[PDB]
Design an enzyme around this catalytic site. Structure first.
Site, PDB file in Angstrom:
ATOM      1  N   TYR A 155       0.807  -1.216   0.000  1.00 15.97           N
ATOM      2  CA  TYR A 155       0.000   0.000   0.000  1.00 15.97           C
ATOM      3  C   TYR A 155       0.844   1.273   0.000  1.00 15.97           C
ATOM      4  O   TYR A 155       0.348   2.323   0.424  1.00 15.97           O
ATOM      5  CB  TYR A 155      -0.938   0.019   1.218  1.00 15.97           C
ATOM      6  CG  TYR A 155      -1.961  -1.094   1.222  1.00 15.97           C
ATOM      7  CD1 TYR A 155      -3.155  -0.970   0.523  1.00 15.97           C
ATOM      8  CD2 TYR A 155      -1.734  -2.271   1.924  1.00 15.97           C
ATOM      9  CE1 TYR A 155      -4.093  -1.985   0.524  1.00 15.97           C
ATOM     10  CE2 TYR A 155      -2.666  -3.291   1.931  1.00 15.97           C
ATOM     11  CZ  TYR A 155      -3.843  -3.143   1.229  1.00 15.97           C
ATOM     12  OH  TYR A 155      -4.774  -4.156   1.232  1.00 15.97           O
ATOM     13  N   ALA A 324     -57.619 -65.243 -22.987  1.00 18.70           N
ATOM     14  CA  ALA A 324     -57.449 -64.343 -21.857  1.00 18.70           C
ATOM     15  C   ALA A 324     -57.137 -65.127 -20.588  1.00 18.70           C
ATOM     16  O   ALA A 324     -57.542 -66.281 -20.425  1.00 18.70           O
ATOM     17  CB  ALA A 324     -58.707 -63.498 -21.653  1.00 18.70           C
ATOM     18  N   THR A 325     -56.403 -64.483 -19.680  1.00 16.86           N
ATOM     19  CA  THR A 325     -56.011 -65.098 -18.413  1.00 16.86           C
ATOM     20  C   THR A 325     -55.147 -66.334 -18.655  1.00 16.86           C
ATOM     21  O   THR A 325     -55.426 -67.426 -18.154  1.00 16.86           O
ATOM     22  CB  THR A 325     -57.242 -65.446 -17.570  1.00 16.86           C
ATOM     23  OG1 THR A 325     -58.223 -64.410 -17.699  1.00 16.86           O
ATOM     24  CG2 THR A 325     -56.860 -65.603 -16.105  1.00 16.86           C
ATOM     25  N   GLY A 327     -51.472 -65.937 -18.581  1.00 15.17           N
ATOM     26  CA  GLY A 327     -50.131 -65.476 -18.289  1.00 15.17           C
ATOM     27  C   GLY A 327     -49.640 -64.341 -19.156  1.00 15.17           C
ATOM     28  O   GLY A 327     -48.443 -64.034 -19.125  1.00 15.17           O
TER      29      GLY A 327
END
Lengths: 478, 67
Positions: A155, A324-325, A327
């Site tokens: 400074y 249907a049904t 697996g």
DNA sequence: CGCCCAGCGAGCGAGCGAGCGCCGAGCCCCAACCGCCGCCA
């Protein structure tokens, strides 16, 4: 060794700041003249004359008084004469040897009282703060600021000629830079080198940020795209997170981020394939369903693995044919619920059939029925190719190659067109599916296939891979 | 009641200066002085007091003085 | 008679504020569009 930054504003106008000053003092100040030392290279015309002598006398008397009141003539100091915004000043520095911080005030006051009625001959300066010490905080309560040796080159020395006239000191390292720009620059560079060396000696980094990152990572690793699965998997973590008021928006943000990262960088086989190995796969429901219909469990598993990984390319679809049904719906729903973002084809809505199929991982086609009005887009979606569609009450969107599954009892190759049927588009659909004749019916106490069962099945599939021939009709086990 | 505060004295002085000079709308503010309008707008609240002061000065000049 | 308390003071820094600033969520009002109704052969 610390130092005290003593500020001394030197009066500029001897008539305005020091009214009534004796004529002899002004005459002596104006008659005195200095000269550049032998080892000097600074322009003397720029530097003033009387202010230099005034500052020299001031700092000399100050140093003598300090050495006398401290009882220690062997002490380090540093003086620098400069020019403020509109008044001359200095930046004297004195070591703390023999003078503590609590006594600096009394010594400074004594030196101030000694200055008057001796140097000015009774007259006092009008410039405020003509002789004080730089304090830490800006105010009366601020304490003494004990600087260090590194404060000078940080400074004072970096200043230039108009901000640095003459500097006096006794340190050997600073004795050379008393009246020379070359030595000043050399010392400034040598000190900046060490300053940089000491200094050397995007992603947000914080506790909350890292915690949220780990949280979203662990949540994406488990597969929780919405609050539905969060409470199902671990309901205590959701409560612990929602307790905080700041977590409200964070939960939604994490959910959206996980969803986007999955839609951008993620595949179905990653979550479909289990992590831990499987030692007893015969107890699985998918294995029993595949073995009861005569299909080779190993071959069916390899076909499923290849279909999930897009290994066949055009043949990136599986079709479970049978009553249907038997697996079909069970395994379909299981595989659809196992992975996040599952699609659903709405064959009943001929205007927007492929609506809930954008940004999905497993396109489920429950009870599908091919028609002449949805044959073109179907040939492209089933064959694993990019193609745009029209959504219901929404804008168009593209469907990237995604695994698709079909489960129905009617013939999918038969293209329905009102009160008639045509088999023109038979080979294109046959060369892009995997017909699975599941004619064997399951028992009432078979139970639905859980999510862990699909993971175990896919894991066992990855561990046992066999050559799968590209064909429409799957080969049944012996 | 009354209340004293360093943040209210400046506002009162500004209102008095505006009533003295006679600032009708915001356009005349820049005409009379630009630095003041820049400083009072640079605050974090931005335009939370400018409109209030304008309305207050207008009402004061209307109810008190007249054409 | 050259010290004596010893009486005085002048700060004096580690505290105390208190007062503002800058986010931080959190309500709040407003504008570009949807549902439903009027309008004629």
């Amino acid at each position: 060794p610390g130092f005290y930054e003593i500020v001394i504003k030197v009066p500029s106008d001897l008539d305005e700041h020091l009214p009534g000053i004796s004529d002899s003092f002004v005459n002596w100040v104006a008659e005195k003249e200095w000269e550049l030392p032998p080892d000097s290279d600074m322009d003397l015309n720029l530097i003033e004359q009387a202010p230099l002598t005034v500052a020299e006398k001031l700092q000399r008397d100050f140093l003598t008084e300090w050495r006398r009141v401290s009882k220690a003539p062997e002490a380090l100091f540093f003086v620098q004469f400069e020019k403020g915004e509109s008044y001359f000043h200095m930046h004297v520095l004195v070591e703390t040897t023999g003078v503590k911080s609590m006594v600096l005030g009394r010594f400074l006051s004594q030196i101030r009282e000694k200055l008057i009625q001796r140097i000015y001959r009774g007259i006092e300066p009008t410039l405020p703060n003509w002789f004080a010490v730089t304090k830490t905080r800006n105010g009366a309560g601020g304490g003494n600021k004990v600087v260090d040796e590194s404060y000078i080159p940080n400074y004072l020395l970096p200043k230039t000629q108009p901000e640095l006239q003459w500097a006096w000191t006794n340190m050997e390292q600073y004795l050379s830079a008393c009246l020379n720009l070359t030595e000043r620059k050399r010392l400034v560079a040598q000190h900046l080198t060490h300053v940089s060396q000491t200094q050397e000696q995007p992603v947000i980094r914080s506790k909350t940020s890292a915690r949220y990152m780990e949280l979203v990572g662990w949540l994406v690793d488990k597969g929780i795209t919405s609050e539905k699965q969060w409470i199902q998997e671990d309901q205590a973590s959701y409560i612990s997170f929602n307790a905080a008021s700041n977590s409200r928006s964070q939960i939604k943000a994490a959910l959206d981020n996980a969803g986007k990262i999955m839609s951008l960088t993620k595949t179905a086989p990653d979550y479909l394939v289990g992590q831990q190995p499987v030692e007893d796969i015969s107890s699985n429901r998918i294995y029993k369903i595949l073995e009861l219909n005569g299909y080779d469990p190993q071959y069916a598993a390899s076909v499923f693995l290849g279909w999930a990984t897009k290994k066949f390319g055009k043949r990136n679809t599986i079709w479970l044919f049978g009553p249907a049904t038997t697996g079909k719906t069970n395994i379909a729903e299981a595989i659809a619920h196992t992975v996040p973002f599952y699609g659903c084809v709405n064959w009943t809505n001929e205007n927007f059939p492929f609506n809930d199929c954008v940004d999905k991982m497993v396109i489920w086609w429950e009870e599908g029925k091919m028609t002449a009005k949805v044959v073109e887009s179907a040939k492209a979606i089933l064959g694993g190719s990019k193609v745009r569609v029209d959504q219901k009450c929404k804008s168009s969107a593209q469907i990237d190659p995604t695994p698709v599954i079909v489960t129905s009892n009617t013939n999918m190759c038969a293209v329905i067109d009102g009160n008639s049927t045509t088999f023109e588009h038979q080979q294109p659909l046959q060369d892009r599916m995997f017909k699975f004749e599941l004619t064997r019916r399951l028992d009432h106490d078979f139970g639905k296939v859980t999510k862990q069962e699909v993971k175990d099945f896919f894991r066992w599939a990855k561990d046992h891979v066999v050559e799968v021939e590209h064909e429409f009709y799957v080969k049944k086990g012996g």
